[PDB]
Subunit: 114 residues, 4 copies
Amino acid sequence: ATQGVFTLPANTQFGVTAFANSAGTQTVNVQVNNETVATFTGQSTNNAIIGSKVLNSGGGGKVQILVSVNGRSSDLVSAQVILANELNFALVGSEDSTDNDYNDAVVVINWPLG
Amino acid sequence: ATQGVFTLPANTQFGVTAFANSAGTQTVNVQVNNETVATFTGQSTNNAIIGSKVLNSGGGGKVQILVSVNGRSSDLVSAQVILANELNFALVGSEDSTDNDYNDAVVVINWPLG
Amino acid sequence: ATQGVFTLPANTQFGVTAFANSAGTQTVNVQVNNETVATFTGQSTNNAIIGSKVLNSGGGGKVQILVSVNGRSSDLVSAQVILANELNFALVGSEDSTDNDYNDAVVVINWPLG
Amino acid sequence: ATQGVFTLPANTQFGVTAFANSAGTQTVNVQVNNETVATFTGQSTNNAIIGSKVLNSGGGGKVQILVSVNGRSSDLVSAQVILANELNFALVGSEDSTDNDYNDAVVVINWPLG
Ligand SMILES: [Ca+2]
Ligand SMILES: [Ca+2]
Ligand SMILES: [Ca+2]
Ligand SMILES: [Ca+2]
Ligand SMILES: [Ca+2]
Ligand SMILES: [Ca+2]
Ligand SMILES: [Ca+2]
Ligand SMILES: [Ca+2]
């Protein structure tokens, strides 16, 4: 299945935060309605935050996360979870090698804000 | 139900990150096997990160999040989600008032690291 | 927090299924836009299905689960999870006594159908 | 990523329930520790239950779901969610064709029982 794609409500503010856990330098691209609106880059084997931003989901509400290491696409896993019928998490893990920890870059998207 | 309590694997490294979305100043306490091992305080209505740390789950693996505003306990909601049978997220929302957005402090715990 | 309340897309077919794991006879009440549309009753300590129905979410899309045993309200826990940005589960556990297993009646709501 | 594989606690009773939403006859295979312990075969475009069984997770706790239609593997998606730090759902969707609804066979694994 396609992974890392989420439909948000339209024109809604959301937070996107990325953590790194790999020897490889991670590149996280955030696309909103098929336009790149953020790129995070960093390296950590200790969960360092390599980016955190507030973005808007725009008309289509389509938010896609892509992760690469040195231009090679990582394999993704994802889900969305909603708590108390209001608090949304869109969760992505990525795998840049063979160990299947899926934590090489971890991306957490949350809404609503404010 | 009790919320904000999670059983991790023993002696395991995990990340904890807290976000704020309220007029009220948020205090997030992190307890590992009933000892307070981190405390984050901060105020934001725009999802600012008010703390991020790497901790060890210790022998019991018990991780509890408590949130308060002005010394008053916030109501919590929580769940744990596992992706690819390996990547774990323990998720907490908290409500300090009456609107029920449960985002006033948002806490994300992730493991494994490295 | 209020639990057992979910917002579905409007005018959408959904499935609701209830399982029992208790000595007590479970009564599961299903409301759609604040009107009772189903009631499932049954007893099992071995996960027997006590009801499965297809319903429509109507204009408001509001679905609520309540659980009681001999007229006494059970404590609820719930969450919604979305897979592949399309497959939805709305999940309820309920606790009729003291052991905190939350499985006394378990309710799974799924959409889309067809 | 591999999907439809879950680690349960050892020697634990669990329920497995399959729903069908396709024109195609669905064959759901359940393995516990790499041995077939159940096979559900049925057809429905309206969420009918094509199998429900109680099984034991055995020493390894490994549970795998595979879905096929006329001998051809469906694409799977999955996740595990834990409520109240005790109530577990392991969730599978499967796609037998092109529409990406992932509901053609839907598998819900729950524990604990009793
Ligand atoms: Ca890896
Ligand atoms: Ca890693
Ligand atoms: Ca609030
Ligand atoms: Ca708020
Ligand atoms: Ca109970
Ligand atoms: Ca029970
Ligand atoms: Ca399909
Ligand atoms: Ca279908």
